[PDB]
Structure 1
Amino acid sequence: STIEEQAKTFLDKFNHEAEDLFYQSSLASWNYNTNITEENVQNMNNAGDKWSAFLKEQSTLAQMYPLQEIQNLTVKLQLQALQQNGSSVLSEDKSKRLNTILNTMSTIYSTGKVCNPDNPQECLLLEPGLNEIMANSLDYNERLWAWESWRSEVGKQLRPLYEEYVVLKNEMARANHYEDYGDYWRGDYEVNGVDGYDYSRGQLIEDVEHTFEEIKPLYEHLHAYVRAKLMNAYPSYISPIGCLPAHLLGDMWGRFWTNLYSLTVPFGQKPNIDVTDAMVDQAWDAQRIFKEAEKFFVSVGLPNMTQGFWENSMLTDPGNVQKAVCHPTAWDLGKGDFRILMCTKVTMDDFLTAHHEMGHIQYDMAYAAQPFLLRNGANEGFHEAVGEIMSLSAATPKHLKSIGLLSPDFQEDNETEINFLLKQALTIVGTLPFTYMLEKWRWMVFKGEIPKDQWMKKWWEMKREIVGVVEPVPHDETYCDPASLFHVSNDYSFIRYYTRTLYQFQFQEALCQAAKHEGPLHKCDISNSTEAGQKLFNMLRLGKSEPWTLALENVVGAKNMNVRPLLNYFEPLFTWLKDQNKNSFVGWSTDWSPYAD
């Protein structure tokens, strides 16, 4: 007859009913996702709304147990993850307005159009063609027109909606004792009551700003190299001591630089490893790839596939009429059912994406013993890191020369080493400054440090200060550039892409020390080494049961995220770069501009 012994009694029934209803809803969602028809849409929406209403009723019922007297930590975690009102704490009118403006923002982002100044009946959407002109073209004026029009004709519609979404989210977060909407987002890395692993929401900003301070000595050199190379594709447009114009980076916003590799390849006379002709000329089918991936995963000591995975998963594209949107995902329908959905071909990128997906599948198979509310990653960034280190280790020449895709000798030279490391750097270390800057800007906006009459000015100031790119055309306070991004207009968090990049290399260097590696870090494999599988499974089976700063210690040996593994991974490229800029000027000045003339 206590206020704790009722919590477990309620939690058992909730777990049972929730598992049942969630399996129903997820099965309906899969039935739609793999077979796009008309009745399947309503068959999925029905179960979806039923599960949502059930969760809402359980949430408004679980507010009878005060979190102040609960003593056990697992039941406390479950109740706290179930108790949060979230939205709907506002009045009804405000909630309707917020939902309407969110839907309007998503619709405006999805279906925007911009057409030529000399032929107004040939406009293209973003996805099929705009980020293709921005990715494949080599003409200055065309890229400039695209980058300017996509922000002038679609961005100008999002400002009077963002200026209200900010206020609505601020109120929704202040009604839950969070002081702003940014603290609500950082509330995922929050840890209380462990006596040795505490982590307050406010320390995340300090950790990010103190770990980003060690990457600049590498990003500056990479930037100087990219600039000294770009000054040969568009001469008389880049000055040797200025920033890079924000439209010559490779895509619409400059999030990834990977589309620049055709211009800045160090040794353009050595083709990097691409085992796609061997796979095709050795008659490899869509099932052999998954068999090889399962063999690799069972080599390290993780369990086999559940045998319910081979009969129901959709590995091949259904031909005649079964039109199905196949973006590769791994499903966790529950009750011991794991499925994979991807229209695979026989190439190398899908051969790596198979390992990436089986990473998520193994993760979801590991912690399937915890209660329902604790079936997730340790935080919002562990899942993709676990899924990524596998594909990172599954593309090394030592591994590919033992499966059979490569010749058994395949003489190696340091030139292909540099090629691969540089192609990796233009995607890994090329997005961290942009991510950190965008997150800092959104935090400073939500908190209230930037009055609404100084948004674009501070945004471009921070872009000139941190990332190192400058706008090609002045932008006044009528535009809205941040809202023209997908993650900003649909209300998605962005800080996870900065912690995943560090967790990935921390895990990699931690496991590569268990397999007793000898050479540099980027030539290691964790296959055929059983201790690595044990060290990884010691963290895989936890879920959200323990604070993430504990599951991070079980594999690495530290308490917080670090940045030394990344520089240890990129050391060779770092040296070769430091020996390449004897005549250039490493760094940038924030005064030059492509219109100040």
Structure 2
Amino acid sequence: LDPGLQPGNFSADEAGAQLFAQSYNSSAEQVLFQSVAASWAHDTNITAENARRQEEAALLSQEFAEAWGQKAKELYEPIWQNFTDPQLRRIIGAVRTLGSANLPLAKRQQYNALLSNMSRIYSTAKVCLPNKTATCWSLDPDLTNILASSRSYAMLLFAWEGWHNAAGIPLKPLYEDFTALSNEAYKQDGFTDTGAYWRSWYNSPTFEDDLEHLYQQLEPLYLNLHAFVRRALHRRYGDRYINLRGPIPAHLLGDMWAQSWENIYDMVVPFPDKPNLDVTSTMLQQGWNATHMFRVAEEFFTSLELSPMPPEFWEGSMLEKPADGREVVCHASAWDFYNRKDFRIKQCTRVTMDQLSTVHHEMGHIQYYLQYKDLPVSLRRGANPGFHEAIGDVLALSVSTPEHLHKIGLLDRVTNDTESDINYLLKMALEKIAFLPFGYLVDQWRWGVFSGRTPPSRYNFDWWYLRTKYQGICPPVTRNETHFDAGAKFHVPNVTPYIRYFVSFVLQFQFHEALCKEAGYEGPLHQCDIYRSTKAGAKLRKVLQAGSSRPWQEVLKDMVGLDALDAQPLLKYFQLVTQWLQEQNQQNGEVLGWPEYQWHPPLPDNYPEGIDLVTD
């Protein structure tokens, strides 16, 4: 048994715990490196050969965590909370979390394979017309593309139900057992249930209470936005299917999960005549190419006097669709090998304005890793799990502005037209604000499941109850206790929390408002840029530098000034769209909210016979 993989002898003392932690850090980064190294190899070079390695390196990592966790859990758990330095408590607290590993091996297999099956079913789920069609439609491209692009209610419904039938129905039996074993494992760790464990990451004694108050402060913005989309859908589909006072059919909102309303912008766009300024056409004539795009992004960070990329980045990063033509996970991602000496971005970059914005986002993560690279490995993560995304986003917000684009040189004049930016801001409002209630209700639901507030006979009653109460949606078809629509969202059977994204979105604008205030800027917040503001850069740098050492709330108070999340900065960013929508809503007499919730559409006249009929 490798000494580099198994812990030694240590007393229950802080001096012992310090020695143990230090030993954990040294071996831990070694282990993490191997796992990610093969991961990067396969992800950058898609082949079954590397997949076998990826599986092997990840397997080793768990045995490592079990060895150290095993010793830690037995050794300090009776005393650990008393260690003086919170720094030490944080490291030990992370390692002492064993999770599933606690299960006896017979249950481990049952729990582990079970999780594997849930993932298979979701990705495997196939939706087939009630005809012996030669080939069915998978989640993407066909199902997502047809649902995002199609606008024939009859057609759109059938695709939506088919997905929930195929994905949802088979997960329901399995998910109960996962609930049983998952909570069983965490009980041995010391959490009342899986929910208590997920909430534990934010170190907020009133965490769930905090979110409700945040969400109630955003609801005025959401209801106004919801009312406007409801009206627009009514113009397109007709009163038979959109009750001005009631909830919106879930399948008509432009995406399989109604989590993003981005695809309906074409119907709702204010001031439809102003074109969205796309710099692609100028970018091409400028001779720019993917490789230069990244150095352009670095220049922005250098303007913020943050750390410029290490040469290791230019060497490692997989900036393009490789000319070798070997397969790659072209979906852009940012990687940090816990090896202090390197960090890499995988973009598969192609020259579009969107990717320019995307590259800035990804480079923000790299910047984030570099600033806390000095901390011990257990702390080299976001201040809170949602904190990581927020930093990446705020950087992306600043660069999207035409004010910034002119500074880079891609634009001759910064036309200060309110119709142009409202057009833009509404697309963002459809893209992300519509997401908040959804991101909140999924983890709102899951804590209920793990907590038992939703016993098994209610998996679907509560999901639609919650989904309607918060998001303002009801199902396209009456659905009952045989179903398990929770299983229809990727994050559910893959057991990945959603709350991180909701909290991240509030933190995104909360940081943004802080930097603008630091940058001496004034007036419209959505016209703010942090470029060249070194004094703001130092403030941002501080928040990154702390990593996970300091409790997330304590750091946030130093940055923005408030010990907790708040909606006020987010609202100010959207002040213009808030003002404009209310007038549009006020004129039409929209009922803000959704009384008479117990209303939903009739079925299509010949459903499912009429599902392919031309209606455009």
TM-score bucket (shorter structure): over 0.9
Seen in structure 2, the aligned counterparts of structure 1 residues 434 and 48 have a Cα distance that, compared at 3 Å, is closer
Cα distance per residue 1:213-271 (max 9 Å; x no partner) = 11122211111111111112212432222221111001111000011101111111111
Cα distance per residue 1:395-415 (max 9 Å; x no partner) = 1111111212112x2433211
Match of 1:493 in 2: 497
Q: Give the counterpart of 1:370 among 372, 375, 379.
A: 375
Match of 2:33 in 1: 23
Cα distance per residue 1:347-383 (max 9 Å; x no partner) = 1111011100110001100011111221111110111
1:209 aligns with 2:219: no
Q: Give the counterpart of 1:232 among 232, 235, 259.
A: 235
Maintained 8 Å contact 1:552/1:559: yes
Maintained 8 Å contact 1:316/1:344: yes
Maintained 8 Å contact 1:228/1:584: no
Match of 1:219 in 2: 222
How far, CA to CA, are the matches of 1:45 and 1:537 in structure 2?
36
Residue 95 of structure 1 deviates from its aligned partner by 2.1
Match of 2:542 in 1: 538
Match of 1:196 in 2: none
How far, CA to CA, are the matches of 2:58 and 2:165 in structure 1?
38
Q: Superposition pairs for residues 136-151 of structure 1, below 5 Å?
A: 136-151=149-164
Residue 498 of structure 1 deviates from its aligned partner by 1.2
How far, CA to CA, are the matches of 1:288 and 1:245 in structure 2?
45
Maintained 8 Å contact 1:23/1:335: no
How far, CA to CA, are the matches of 2:37 and 2:273 in structure 1?
51
Cα-Cα RMSD = 1.8
Partner SS, residue 221 of structure 2: helix
Maintained 8 Å contact 1:535/1:554: no
How far, CA to CA, are the matches of 1:503 and 1:320 in structure 2?
41
Seen in structure 2, the aligned counterparts of structure 1 residues 299 and 98 have a Cα distance that, compared at 3 Å, is same
How far, CA to CA, are the matches of 2:18 and 2:588 in structure 1?
69
1:176 aligns with 2:192: no
Residue 455 of structure 1 deviates from its aligned partner by 2.7
Match of 2:384 in 1: 379
How far, CA to CA, are the matches of 1:445 and 1:125 in structure 2?
28
Partner SS, residue 331 of structure 1: strand
Match of 1:554 in 2: 558
Maintained 8 Å contact 1:330/1:360: yes
Seen in structure 2, the aligned counterparts of structure 1 residues 176 and 2 have a Cα distance that, compared at 3 Å, is closer
Match of 1:595 in 2: 602
The residue identity in structure 2 corresponding to 1:339 is R
1:64 aligns with 2:70: no
Seen in structure 2, the aligned counterparts of structure 1 residues 10 and 436 have a Cα distance that, compared at 3 Å, is closer
Residue 572 of structure 1 deviates from its aligned partner by 1.0
Number of residue pairs the alignment of both structures matches: 586
How far, CA to CA, are the matches of 2:98 and 2:374 in structure 1?
27
Residue 423 of structure 1 deviates from its aligned partner by 0.7
Q: Superposition pairs for residues 30-45 of structure 1, below 5 Å?
A: 30-45=40-55
Match of 1:105 in 2: 118
How far, CA to CA, are the matches of 1:26 and 1:163 in structure 2?
32
Match of 2:422 in 1: 418
Maintained 8 Å contact 1:286/1:346: yes
Match of 2:346 in 1: 341
Residue 303 of structure 1 deviates from its aligned partner by 1.7
How far, CA to CA, are the matches of 1:282 and 1:43 in structure 2?
42
How far, CA to CA, are the matches of 2:271 and 2:26 in structure 1?
60
Q: Give the counterpart of 1:484 among 479, 485, 488.
A: 488
Partner SS, residue 236 of structure 2: coil
Seen in structure 2, the aligned counterparts of structure 1 residues 410 and 387 have a Cα distance that, compared at 3 Å, is closer
Match of 1:132 in 2: 145
Seen in structure 2, the aligned counterparts of structure 1 residues 458 and 16 have a Cα distance that, compared at 3 Å, is closer
How far, CA to CA, are the matches of 2:250 and 2:93 in structure 1?
44
The residue identity in structure 1 corresponding to 2:379 is L
Maintained 8 Å contact 1:386/1:504: yes
Residue 38 of structure 1 deviates from its aligned partner by 4.0
Maintained 8 Å contact 1:3/1:69: no
Higher helix content, 1 or 2: 2
Maintained 8 Å contact 1:243/1:592: yes
Partner SS, residue 340 of structure 1: strand
Partner SS, residue 345 of structure 2: strand
Match of 1:193 in 2: none
1:475 aligns with 2:479: yes
Residue 163 of structure 1 deviates from its aligned partner by 2.0
The residue identity in structure 2 corresponding to 1:44 is Q
Q: Superposition pairs for residues 304-343 of structure 1, below 5 Å?
A: 304-333=308-337, 334-343=339-348
Residue 430 of structure 1 deviates from its aligned partner by 0.6
How far, CA to CA, are the matches of 1:519 and 1:233 in structure 2?
37
Query: Which residues of structure 2 form unaligned runs of 5+?
Result: 1-10, 605-616
The residue identity in structure 2 corresponding to 1:402 is K
1:53 aligns with 2:63: yes
Residue 2 of structure 1 deviates from its aligned partner by 7.8
Maintained 8 Å contact 2:66/2:101: no
Match of 2:4 in 1: none
Seen in structure 2, the aligned counterparts of structure 1 residues 481 and 69 have a Cα distance that, compared at 3 Å, is closer
The residue identity in structure 2 corresponding to 1:64 is L
Maintained 8 Å contact 1:220/1:586: no
Cα distance per residue 1:143-190 (max 9 Å; x no partner) = 011011111233111111112222222222223322222101101012
Residue 22 of structure 1 deviates from its aligned partner by 2.5
Residue 390 of structure 1 deviates from its aligned partner by 0.5
Match of 2:201 in 1: 188
How far, CA to CA, are the matches of 2:480 and 2:272 in structure 1?
42
Match of 1:404 in 2: 409
How far, CA to CA, are the matches of 2:81 and 2:523 in structure 1?
53
Q: Give the counterpart of 1:118 among 110, 115, 131.
A: 131
Q: Superposition pairs for residues 429-444 of structure 1, below 5 Å?
A: 429-444=433-448
The residue identity in structure 2 corresponding to 1:359 is G
How far, CA to CA, are the matches of 1:69 and 1:232 in structure 2?
63
Match of 2:361 in 1: 356
Partner SS, residue 336 of structure 2: strand
1:571 aligns with 2:575: yes
User: 235-244 or 385-394: which moved more?
Assistant: 235-244
Partner SS, residue 252 of structure 2: coil
1:6 aligns with 2:6: no
How far, CA to CA, are the matches of 1:385 and 1:69 in structure 2?
32
Residue 457 of structure 1 deviates from its aligned partner by 2.1
How far, CA to CA, are the matches of 2:80 and 2:46 in structure 1?
44
Maintained 8 Å contact 1:381/1:497: yes
Maintained 8 Å contact 1:4/1:69: no
Maintained 8 Å contact 1:366/1:537: yes
Seen in structure 2, the aligned counterparts of structure 1 residues 37 and 157 have a Cα distance that, compared at 3 Å, is closer
Cα distance per residue 1:499-532 (max 9 Å; x no partner) = 0011111100011001111221110000111111
Cα distance per residue 1:103-144 (max 9 Å; x no partner) = 111101001112112344331111221011100111111101
The residue identity in structure 1 corresponding to 2:36 is S
Match of 1:389 in 2: 394
Query: Which residues of structure 1 form unaligned runs of 5+?
Result: 191-198
How far, CA to CA, are the matches of 2:69 and 2:460 in structure 1?
40
Q: Give the counterpart of 2:245 among 241, 244, 251.
A: 241
Maintained 8 Å contact 1:315/1:340: yes
Cα distance per residue 1:483-510 (max 9 Å; x no partner) = 1110011111111111001111110001
User: 161-170 or 28-37: which moved more?
Assistant: 28-37
Residue 454 of structure 1 deviates from its aligned partner by 2.6
Match of 1:75 in 2: 88
The residue identity in structure 1 corresponding to 2:342 is D
How far, CA to CA, are the matches of 1:94 and 1:38 in structure 2?
29
Residue 69 of structure 1 deviates from its aligned partner by 5.3
Partner SS, residue 486 of structure 1: coil
Match of 1:524 in 2: 528
